[PDB]
Scaffold this active site. Structure first.
Site, PDB file in Angstrom:
ATOM      1  N   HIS A  75      50.288  15.354  62.620  1.00  0.00           N
ATOM      2  CA  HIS A  75      49.095  14.594  63.003  1.00  0.00           C
ATOM      3  C   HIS A  75      48.056  15.487  63.628  1.00  0.00           C
ATOM      4  CE1 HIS A  75      51.884  11.181  62.501  1.00  0.00           C
ATOM      5  NE2 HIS A  75      50.793  10.743  61.897  1.00  0.00           N
ATOM      6  N   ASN A  76      47.438  16.310  62.780  1.00  0.00           N
ATOM      7  CA  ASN A  76      46.518  17.358  63.214  1.00  0.00           C
ATOM      8  C   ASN A  76      45.225  17.300  62.399  1.00  0.00           C
ATOM      9  OD1 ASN A  76      47.002  18.757  60.734  1.00  0.00           O
ATOM     10  ND2 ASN A  76      48.986  19.383  61.624  1.00  0.00           N
ATOM     11  N   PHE A  77      44.334  18.249  62.652  1.00  0.00           N
ATOM     12  CA  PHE A  77      43.031  18.223  62.004  1.00  0.00           C
ATOM     13  C   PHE A  77      43.118  18.342  60.484  1.00  0.00           C
ATOM     14  CE2 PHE A  77      39.317  20.456  60.324  1.00  0.00           C
ATOM     15  CZ  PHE A  77      38.448  19.385  60.417  1.00  0.00           C
ATOM     16  N   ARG A  78      44.066  19.140  60.024  1.00  0.00           N
ATOM     17  CA  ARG A  78      44.231  19.296  58.599  1.00  0.00           C
ATOM     18  C   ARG A  78      44.648  17.977  57.953  1.00  0.00           C
ATOM     19  NH1 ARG A  78      44.323  23.954  56.002  1.00  0.00           N
ATOM     20  NH2 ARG A  78      44.963  25.146  57.844  1.00  0.00           N
ATOM     21  N   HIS A  79      45.514  17.222  58.613  1.00  0.00           N
ATOM     22  CA  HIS A  79      45.916  15.931  58.076  1.00  0.00           C
ATOM     23  C   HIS A  79      44.697  15.045  57.932  1.00  0.00           C
ATOM     24  CE1 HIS A  79      47.547  11.915  57.590  1.00  0.00           C
ATOM     25  NE2 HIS A  79      46.999  11.545  58.738  1.00  0.00           N
ATOM     26  N   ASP A 225      45.781   7.721  53.877  1.00  0.00           N
ATOM     27  CA  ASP A 225      46.563   8.181  55.038  1.00  0.00           C
ATOM     28  C   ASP A 225      47.911   8.698  54.599  1.00  0.00           C
ATOM     29  OD1 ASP A 225      47.060   8.663  57.852  1.00  0.00           O
ATOM     30  OD2 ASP A 225      47.940   6.705  58.149  1.00  0.00           O
ATOM     31  N   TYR A 247      58.851  14.110  63.668  1.00  0.00           N
ATOM     32  CA  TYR A 247      59.897  13.116  63.835  1.00  0.00           C
ATOM     33  C   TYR A 247      61.074  13.622  64.680  1.00  0.00           C
ATOM     34  CZ  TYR A 247      58.216   9.997  60.020  1.00  0.00           C
ATOM     35  OH  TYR A 247      57.587   9.125  59.192  1.00  0.00           O
ATOM     36  N   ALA A 275      64.134  11.358  53.164  1.00  0.00           N
ATOM     37  CA  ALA A 275      62.831  10.949  53.681  1.00  0.00           C
ATOM     38  C   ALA A 275      61.872  10.467  52.551  1.00  0.00           C
ATOM     39  CB  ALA A 275      62.189  12.087  54.465  1.00  0.00           C
TER      40      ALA A 275
HETATM   41  N1  LIG Z   1      58.635   9.711  54.613  1.00  0.00           N
HETATM   42  C1  LIG Z   1      57.303   9.928  54.620  1.00  0.00           C
HETATM   43  N2  LIG Z   1      56.555   9.250  55.486  1.00  0.00           N
HETATM   44  C2  LIG Z   1      55.234   9.473  55.493  1.00  0.00           C
HETATM   45  C3  LIG Z   1      54.605  10.397  54.543  1.00  0.00           C
HETATM   46  N3  LIG Z   1      53.285  10.381  54.787  1.00  0.00           N
HETATM   47  C4  LIG Z   1      53.085   9.502  55.814  1.00  0.00           C
HETATM   48  N4  LIG Z   1      54.261   8.966  56.220  1.00  0.00           N
HETATM   49  C5  LIG Z   1      54.524   7.977  57.288  1.00  0.00           C
HETATM   50  O1  LIG Z   1      53.559   6.936  57.228  1.00  0.00           O
HETATM   51  C6  LIG Z   1      52.870   6.885  58.467  1.00  0.00           C
HETATM   52  C7  LIG Z   1      51.416   6.462  58.336  1.00  0.00           C
HETATM   53  O2  LIG Z   1      50.848   6.479  59.649  1.00  0.00           O
HETATM   54  P1  LIG Z   1      51.127   7.667  60.736  1.00  0.00           P
HETATM   55  O3  LIG Z   1      49.974   8.687  60.529  1.00  0.00           O
HETATM   56  O4  LIG Z   1      51.391   6.960  62.056  1.00  0.00           O
HETATM   57  O5  LIG Z   1      52.587   8.297  60.356  1.00  0.00           O
HETATM   58  C8  LIG Z   1      52.949   8.299  58.987  1.00  0.00           C
HETATM   59  C9  LIG Z   1      54.362   8.659  58.633  1.00  0.00           C
HETATM   60  O6  LIG Z   1      55.286   8.104  59.558  1.00  0.00           O
HETATM   61  C10 LIG Z   1      55.512  11.082  53.622  1.00  0.00           C
HETATM   62  O7  LIG Z   1      55.129  11.905  52.768  1.00  0.00           O
HETATM   63  N5  LIG Z   1      56.796  10.811  53.749  1.00  0.00           N
HETATM   64 NA    NA Z   2      47.560   9.330  59.778  1.00  0.00          NA
HETATM   65 NA    NA Z   3      47.905   7.264  62.014  1.00  0.00          NA
END
Ligand SMILES: Nc1nc2c(ncn2[C@@H]2O[C@@H]3COP(=O)(O)O[C@H]3[C@H]2O)c(=O)[nH]1
Ligand code: NA
Ligand code: NA
Ligand SMILES: CC(C)Cn1c(=O)n(C)c(=O)c2nc[nH]c21
Ligand code: NA
Ligand code: NA
Lengths: 328, 328
Positions: A75-79, A225, A247, A275
């Site tokens: 959960h960073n700027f790149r995301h 997202d 996680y 996952a």
């Molecule tokens: N397993 C998995 N979960 C993801 C992926 N991308 C997003 N998520 C989940 O979906 C959520 C969407 O909102 P958040 O940014 O809170 O956190 C994210 C992750 O928990 C992925 O590629 N794989």
């Molecule tokens: Na997000």
């Molecule tokens: Na989010």
């Protein structure tokens, strides 16, 4: 291309072009290059033109957004840049400018850029169970997302960052409302609820119904997202390790502090493959399947990579499992 | 009664008896006496017994809550006392202990005590229009009520005030959730919505259905909150001047700041009579009418006073109008 060499923050013509597509390699670029990309999107979409955004404010604002993202593994700027660039891609792929007003596009894009501001790198379940300050501030209601959103408008309230300073108050209020809805809609706790409301509307979808369109915009931001796996495999794959990094940080802490652990974040029960397989089959494919009912071109560009990724993770699992059949 | 004189914060037997009824004169008492009243309620309803509330903590907590009410004309500690005292009256009047668990009674009472914590004396519309820190913190969503609730739990998180310290986490979570729902329900912007949902459930009410009960509890807190006119006239009437005093403070400030002014708060346009007539006929009566369907004793004890007040206030307006007319 070019007869001389330019600074990286002068995006090349090839990059500008590549940026319109979901194949863009979001890893190639440093933050100041990403910031240039975001800037370009605002010009290219006509948002600077149509909302009289002072071009230097646009930059100050992005720089300030950047400063307020944290160095989390995921959960960073790149995301945030991924999410924004996938939204950019979606605008072209789905000809969203035919369907949505510029105000709606502004909302989508700005919500996308701001949707995870100042994320602490532990989710809402951690906040609530640990009774953190945020959980208490927001009464256990989408605390992170309320916070992202509040931080967004705190930034926009600083006059030198206020890209909306030339929009009249009615427009400001319209944008504000839209962004709040959209940012709040990214809370995955509500995924099934939002998907249901959407499918209901999809029974007889109506582009001139505000309620239908809010739900579409909510689905659009939710798509972007969680879109990493839509991207080419070499681009998507590194993100999974980042996700698990975050996680596992949380679930370890939960164990240490006596708080409940989620099995899908449990170091012991989770691999990349496990996952992604469930997430792809049961969250991503279905969502994008319904989006495709409105925008068919989505099937080829985005469902296909998802099918391919699903199948590859299934293969990888076959071999992970073998590998633990030694051991143990 | 008694053979010697006791300090005022030792409530007399006569006071203890009177506290159980909606006729109680909320104006007779100083803060410390009102605190002793709230304290007695927790003991008398068995809540100290059934949740192992440490009796000194109960007092610290009440003192702390008292300190976090502000000295507003209307939304002040004494109002909080009314709302709580009316809930206490309702517990007996409606034999709520037959219908509700003690956990629910704890929720109703603690929500009732905390529902207006740290009110600034200007309503949500002012917060949203002036774009205050609260409006921005809570993204225009019931900012005041979110705030009251956050402050409630900030207080309860200070260990010396944590009256829930001997409740297990599952209990805590259950109480917290309830209190949040109920405090949030007090925002009058949601009145018509909440009333409609309740009326739906009333078509076939079911005391064993958690959703039915949440709605009932929501109605009960909403009743107690706006219950001033249910009280004897001499106790009810002074509160109208306080309410208007706060409203006029807000509309004056809006007038000054260039923000929109709500006609119902405009000192040029309002009187005690006009304020209360519509509010009684169209918000209060209907609300209590539906509660009477479940608790028919509410008719004689609470509707009758509301009818008397309505008629009194219609008559005051008929007179006011006869003056107005007599000059111009
Ligand atoms: N397993 C998995 N979960 C993801 C992926 N991308 C997003 N998520 C989940 O979906 C959520 C969407 O909102 P958040 O940014 O809170 O956190 C994210 C992750 O928990 C992925 O590629 N794989
Ligand atoms: Na997000
Ligand atoms: Na989010
Ligand atoms: C329009 C109405 C909701 C305003 N309003 C209110 O909220 N409360 C709580 C009152 O007691 C009241 N009395 C008159 N108007 C009132
Ligand atoms: Na209130
Ligand atoms: Na109140």
């Amino acid at each position: 291309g070019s007869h001389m060499t330019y600074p990286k923050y002068l995006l090349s013509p090839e990059t500008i072009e590549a940026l319109r597509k979901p194949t863009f390699d979001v890893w190639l670029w440093e933050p100041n290059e990403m910031l240039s990309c975001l800037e370009h999107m605002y010009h290219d979409l006509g948002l600077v033109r149509d909302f009289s955004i002072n071009p230097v404010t646009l930059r100050r604002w992005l720089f300030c957004v950047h400063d307020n993202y944290r160095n989390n593994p995921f959960h960073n700027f790149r995301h945030c840049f991924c999410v924004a660039q996938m939204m950019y891609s979606m605008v072209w792929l789905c000809s969203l400018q035919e369907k949505f007003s510029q105000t709606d596009i502004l909302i989508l894009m700005t919500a996308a850029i701001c949707h995870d501001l100042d994320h602490p790198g532990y989710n809402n379940t951690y906040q609530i169970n640990a009774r953190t300050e945020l959980a208490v501030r927001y009464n256990d209601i989408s605390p992170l997302e309320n916070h992202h959103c509040a931080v967004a408008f705190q930034i926009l309230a600083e006059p030198e960052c206020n890209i909306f300073s030339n929009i009249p108050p009615d427009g400001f209020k319209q944008i504000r409302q839209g962004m709040i809805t959209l940012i709040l809609a990214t809370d995955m706790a509500r995924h099934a609820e939002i998907m249901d409301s959407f499918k209901e509307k999809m029974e007889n979808f109506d582009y001139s119904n505000e309620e239908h369109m809010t739900l579409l915009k909510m689905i659009l931001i939710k798509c972007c997202d969680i879109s990493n796996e839509v991207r080419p495999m070499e681009v998507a794959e590194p993100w999974v390790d980042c996700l698990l990094e975050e996680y596992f940080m949380q679930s370890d802490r939960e164990k240490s502090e006596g708080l409940p652990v989620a099995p899908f974040m449990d170091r012991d029960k989770v691999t990349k493959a496990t996952a992604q397989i469930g997430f792809i089959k049961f969250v991503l494919i279905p969502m994008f399947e319904t989006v495709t009912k409105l925008f068919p071109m989505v099937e080829e560009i985005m469902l296909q990579p998802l099918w391919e990724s699903r199948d590859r993770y299934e293969e990888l699992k076959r071999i992970d499992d073998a590998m633990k059949e030694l051991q143990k």
